[PDB]
Design a protein around this ligand. Structure first.
Ligand SMILES: Cc1cc2nc3c(=O)[nH]c(=O)nc-3n(C[C@H](O)[C@H](O)[C@H](O)COP(=O)(O)OP(=O)(O)OC[C@H]3O[C@@H](n4cnc5c(N)ncnc54)[C@H](O)[C@@H]3O)c2cc1C
Ligand SMILES: NC[C@@H](O)c1ccc(O)cc1
Length: 433
């Protein structure tokens, strides 16, 4: 009687929540598999996360799932102490990972500068704009002005040298997973608030701990608790507010739609979504990048930073294989400028820093070109912190759930999908009671 569109983390956790309350539900999933933009698959001789990878106990919703399904001790840290290379004035500089981290730390300190006034409760991201904001008017003005500023311009205005600008350029090409110069700096500021305003805490939370048994141990865990079957290979095309696809029509008390913004053009809504919501769909988010896995010869502890418009902006060693090869991960700002499955393209990526390392394999999934995704992880363009993700939360019987609409670790983390799927389910339960 409640229809859930999509079998990613948001949809799966909503279903389990409905089940506990005794409410009948049904999940419709377009693809042949569950998990969505989290996807654990064997490639290049080992389980690889083609989507989501990193977790942390400071992420309440992800961590409780880790505990529920037996993964408490099944996490391992990405390797550290890599030889670092970064591109700055068209040239390559070699240093240690702590040289890079200390430069990033100082720049992040300046990047976070208003978060304590904006986010005393970092899970109340729009407090500054609410009727109960008790602070000074200048705080609200700087808040709105920061939504129209990108994170790199904050560091330029503070007078860092060109080297640090190129480092934060590289950093945010990965962070925004797209063009950082069109992004809203408020996204970076909330990440700080959620990480006690320290760069190393932010990095431990988002880029350190990997699941030994992969994201699939969590999403197969949730699906395994479900008492109703998931309808795979059942894309939705219309929703009225209940509608349907390929002729089959569904009736239901309510609809929980977890389809990402980048793929909402495949569904017709009747009545049409409000103008401000539709303008986000047309403008979507800031997530046009791509994630690659590259295998090279030998065992090498490697870290590489390169600014826009490089094919990949952050590349790091992750696994040391038993046949004397290394698997590195990389993040790049523009999916249309790299073939993730072309060994030549992967060799061109490594050649950004070194001429002596040899690519032997490469793989990835281009989430942006994926018809049922149309983006990577959700990130914010200028203006979308205050007029973006919050427009989706109208539709008395239609609900938007998903990591891209979360209050906390929005878009970039499974924690946001687990948060928003569960609370949307509670919205449905409360209204029915
Ligand atoms: C490259 C990349 C790396 C990431 N790394 C991390 C990481 O290290 N750590 C972390 O915490 N998070 C990470 N994430 C983010 C995390 O994967 C997501 O935030 C989360 O999985 C999103 O969950 P969701 O349920 O909201 O969306 P989705 O997983 O996108 O779920 C939506 C579902 O709806 C389906 N669907 C789409 N259209 C239709 C339709 N018309 N009809 C029916 N079904 C449809 C889709 O196939 C999908 O199954 C990463 C994301 C990406 C892209
Ligand atoms: N999905 C990884 C995401 O956590 C991320 C990736 C790169 C960064 O520089 C910051 C955050």
């Amino acid at each position: 009687k409640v229809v859930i569109i999509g079998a990613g983390f948001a949809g799966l956790v909503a279903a389990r929540e409905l089940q506990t309350a005794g409410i009948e539900y049904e999940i419709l999933e377009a693809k042949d598999r569950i998990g969505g933009r989290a996807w654990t698959e064997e490639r290049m001789g080992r389980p690889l996360e083609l989507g989501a990878t990193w977790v942390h106990w400071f992420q309440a919703h992800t961590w409780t799932e880790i505990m529920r399904y037996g993964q408490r001790t099944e996490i391992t840290a990405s390797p550290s102490g890599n030889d670092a290379h970064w591109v700055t004035d068209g040239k390559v500089v070699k240093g240690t990972e702590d040289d890079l981290d200390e430069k990033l730390t100082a720049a992040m300190g300046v990047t976070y500068e208003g978060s304590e006034e904006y986010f005393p409760n970092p899970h109340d991201p729009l407090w500054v704009l609410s009727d109960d904001f008790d602070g000074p008017a200048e705080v609200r003005e700087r808040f709105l002005s920061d939504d129209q500023t990108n994170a790199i311009d904050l560091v330029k205005e503070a007078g860092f040298d060109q080297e640090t600008i190129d480092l934060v350029d590289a950093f945010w090409c990965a962070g925004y997973i797209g063009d950082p110069y069109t992004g809203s700096a408020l996204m970076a500021k909330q990440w700080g608030a959620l990480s006690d305003n320290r760069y190393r805490v932010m990095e431990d939370i988002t880029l350190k701990w990997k699941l030994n048994n992969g994201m699939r141990s969590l999403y197969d865990g949730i699906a395994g608790d479900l008492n109703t079957d998931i309808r795979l290979n059942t894309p939705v095309a219309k929703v009225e507010h209940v509608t349907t696809e390929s002729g089959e029509v569904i009736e239901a008390s309510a609809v929980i739609c977890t389809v990402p913004v980048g793929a909402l053009s495949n569904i017709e809504f009747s009545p049409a979504l409000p103008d401000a919501v539709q303008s986000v769909i047309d403008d979507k988010w800031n997530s046009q990048g791509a994630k690659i896995w590259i295998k090279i010869k030998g065992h090498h502890r490697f870290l590489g930073y390169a600014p826009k418009p490089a094919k990949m902006s952050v590349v790091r060693s992750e696994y040391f294989m038993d046949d004397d090869t290394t698997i590195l991960v990389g993040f790049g700002y523009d999916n249309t400028n790299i073939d993730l499955n072309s060994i030549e393209d992967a060799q061109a990526v490594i050649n950004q820093w070194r001429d002596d390392l040899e690519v032997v394999d490469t793989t990835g999934h281009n989430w942006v070109a994926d018809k049922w995704a149309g983006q990577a992880w959700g990130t914010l363009r200028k203006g979308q912190f205050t007029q973006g993700w919050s427009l989706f939360d109208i539709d008395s019987q239609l609900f938007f759930a998903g990591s891209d609409y979360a209050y906390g670790w929005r878009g970039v983390c499974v924690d946001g999908a687990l948060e928003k799927g569960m609370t949307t389910a509670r919205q449905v339960i409360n209204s029915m009671r």
